Structure 1
Amino acid sequence: MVSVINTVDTSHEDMIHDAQMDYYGIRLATCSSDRSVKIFDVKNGGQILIADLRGHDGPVWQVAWAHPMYGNILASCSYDRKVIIWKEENGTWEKTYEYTGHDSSVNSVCWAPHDFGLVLACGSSDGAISILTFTGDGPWEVKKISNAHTIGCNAVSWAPSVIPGSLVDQPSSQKPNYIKRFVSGGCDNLVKIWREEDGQWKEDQKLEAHSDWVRDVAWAPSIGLPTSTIASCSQDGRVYIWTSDDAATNCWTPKLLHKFNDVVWHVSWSITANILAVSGGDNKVTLWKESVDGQWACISDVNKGQ
């Protein structure tokens, strides 16, 4: 039984596009068409607005929390072509960086695993993906993947730092081989996997099963599984689960999870990679779980009552 634990009045003046909890589940960031990002302390069924972040000139599409080892850092991306990095210092939030290297709307932002440092992926309607890296010394470094998707990139999601199975087959003295990978979805109906090799980003895999724009992509957290899992959703109303049992074979198998009667906007994994949330154009959020036979079942249809 899923129960509503808390209801947050965000006091946004226009449509909310994203809502992200911090790593500890004690802060909520929200972003809106009102061009603001709001941050709430969420404790014991109360909320307190702690920041109203202003710096975008258009609708803010996505927010993403960095890993807490780097402090309280939030990325935001917007229709105004900007990516903004916000940081809290001494209980005050400030704009620490602004990236304007995209020619169109920046639709998605995702922080890399903390093993890689402060690295942010940014997907844009200019069809490019930018990778922003902060080394601690000097300006943010930028690697731009030009023509990542035709027409536009809608979503980006980082792979886990450690390959599935690499902790089971290691005799006691080799460091885990950390491979920088992320997945993207675009307006060319493709899901694409990117890999860093020799300091360059290459298209590692091209995943073909959607018949219209890929709206969102989510790489599943690898908690002790030997398999890599990706979810994708599309304007075609389909949700696919992509699985790869061997990181060497580069073989990805699509499984149709469901076909909705309307557009599917978002897919999000639970931190334990055992539940997938799916958000449709029908104003519903559905929760999906894999059964022991590998079958996906809907375990909750949260009707927005009121």
Structure 2
Amino acid sequence: VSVINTVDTSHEDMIHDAQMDYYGIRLATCSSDRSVKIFDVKNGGQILIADLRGHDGPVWQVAWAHPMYGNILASCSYDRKVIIWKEENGTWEKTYEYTGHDSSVNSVCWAPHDFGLVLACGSSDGAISILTFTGDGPWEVKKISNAHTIGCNAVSWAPSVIPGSLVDQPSSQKPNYIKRFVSGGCDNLVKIWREEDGQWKEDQKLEAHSDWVRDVAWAPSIGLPTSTIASCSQDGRVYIWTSDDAATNCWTPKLLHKFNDVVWHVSWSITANILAVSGGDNKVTLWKESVDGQWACISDVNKGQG
């Protein structure tokens, strides 16, 4: 794919992470410069529309909420805060601030919109916080204390799956979704969490990494029964975890690849089950499963070929 017009974020430091909005009309970016910048890149035309300042340290991750709640952005930082930004009438404001962590908040992820407006937050204090907005009153907080022994680096929600979607549910009850998410931590564990009776419990421990789990990504449901998770680590390995039966809760690790350097995190493509993998070698590799179940690198993107 030939490159188009070159953008300019007018930054003063490394952008740690970047996320497009749901319609791909906006780009949020966050940096060591403590800013969250929003660009409205519609039909080319690079356009800074907001410089959101409110963090006291480096901002690690940004997450767009589903557009059914309006234009909402979450950010998390080394300053131990999670900030919720909302646009009203083209003005961006801080609508909520969560300060319930004792250390750096490394990752944020919005739940599937079927569950409501729910945010998962993973911290270097080893805890995970689930922020829930009900529409009326303050944000509710469910904190999982000691989720990881040393620190939580990454959180990713499971896809919204209706149990028994092949059986006519009587048309008068909201489907009872199995709310799950995965986390990766500095204890080398990938952990799966489930909501039961309004409490979050550890459902599974996944043991294959030999050093800190850097990122975890739950694959979107492509209408297959198989659930897939990617994880990457300081040990240079990427694992694909598969579970063919949601009832067995049996997760099998498959080694994707071992890099010579650290892997940051792997991001799933929405439509093609393609894994993007970002390494310490300054490369981004794209991976796809072949029909024989082997994983092949389909592209190697170097910094500088644009």
Tell me the TM-score range normalised by the shorter chain.
over 0.9
Q: 1:300 to 1:142 in 2, by over 3 A?
A: same
CA deviation profile, 1:70-92 (whole Å, cap 9, x unmatched)? 00000000000000000000000
Q: 1:220 to 1:5 in 2, by over 3 A?
A: farther
**Unaligned segments of structure 1, at least 5 residues:** none
Q: 1:167 to 1:45 in 2, by over 3 A?
A: farther
Partner residue, 1:109? 108
Kept in 1: contact 2:163–2:177 (CA 8 A): no
How much has 1:202 moved relative to structure 2? 0.3
Q: Separation in 2 of the partners of 1:87 and 1:34?
A: 21
CA deviation profile, 1:200-248 (whole Å, cap 9, x unmatched)? 1000010000000000000000021111000000000000000001111
Q: Separation in 2 of the partners of 1:188 and 1:108?
A: 16
Q: 1:163 to 1:258 in 2, by over 3 A?
A: farther
Q: Which runs of 4+ in 1 moved over 6 A?
A: 168-175
Secondary structure of 1:179 counterpart: coil
Kept in 2: contact 1:166–1:176 (CA 8 A): no
For structure 1, which segment, 112-121 or 4-13, has the greater mean C-alpha deviation from structure 2 after superposition? Answer: 4-13
Q: TM-score, normalised by structure 2?
A: 0.96
How much has 1:165 moved relative to structure 2? 7.3
Q: 1:280 to 1:139 in 2, by over 3 A?
A: same
**Unaligned segments of structure 2, at least 5 residues:** none
How much has 1:273 moved relative to structure 2? 5.0
CA deviation profile, 1:20-56 (whole Å, cap 9, x unmatched)? 0000111000000000000001122221100000000
Aligned alpha-carbon RMSD (Å): 1.8
Count of residue pairs brought into register by the alignment:
305
Secondary structure of 1:46 counterpart: coil
Q: 1:199 to 1:175 in 2, by over 3 A?
A: closer
How much has 1:259 moved relative to structure 2? 0.4
Q: 1:300 to 1:97 in 2, by over 3 A?
A: same
Q: Separation in 2 of the partners of 1:117 and 1:177?
A: 12
How much has 1:177 moved relative to structure 2? 3.9
| Identity percentage of aligned residues | 100
Q: 1:166 to 1:246 in 2, by over 3 A?
A: farther
Q: 1:84 to 1:171 in 2, by over 3 A?
A: closer
How much has 1:3 moved relative to structure 2? 4.0
CA deviation profile, 1:104-124 (whole Å, cap 9, x unmatched)? 000000000000110000000
Q: Separation in 2 of the partners of 1:142 and 1:8?
A: 38
Kept in 2: contact 1:221–1:273 (CA 8 A): no
Secondary structure of 1:69 counterpart: helix
Q: Separation in 2 of the partners of 1:304 and 1:233?
A: 20
For structure 1, which segment, 158-167 or 258-267, has the greater mean C-alpha deviation from structure 2 after superposition? Answer: 158-167
Q: Separation in 2 of the partners of 1:174 and 1:82?
A: 37
Q: 1:158 to 1:58 in 2, by over 3 A?
A: same
CA deviation profile, 1:114-150 (whole Å, cap 9, x unmatched)? 0011000000000000000000000000000000001
Q: TM-score, normalised by structure 1?
A: 0.96
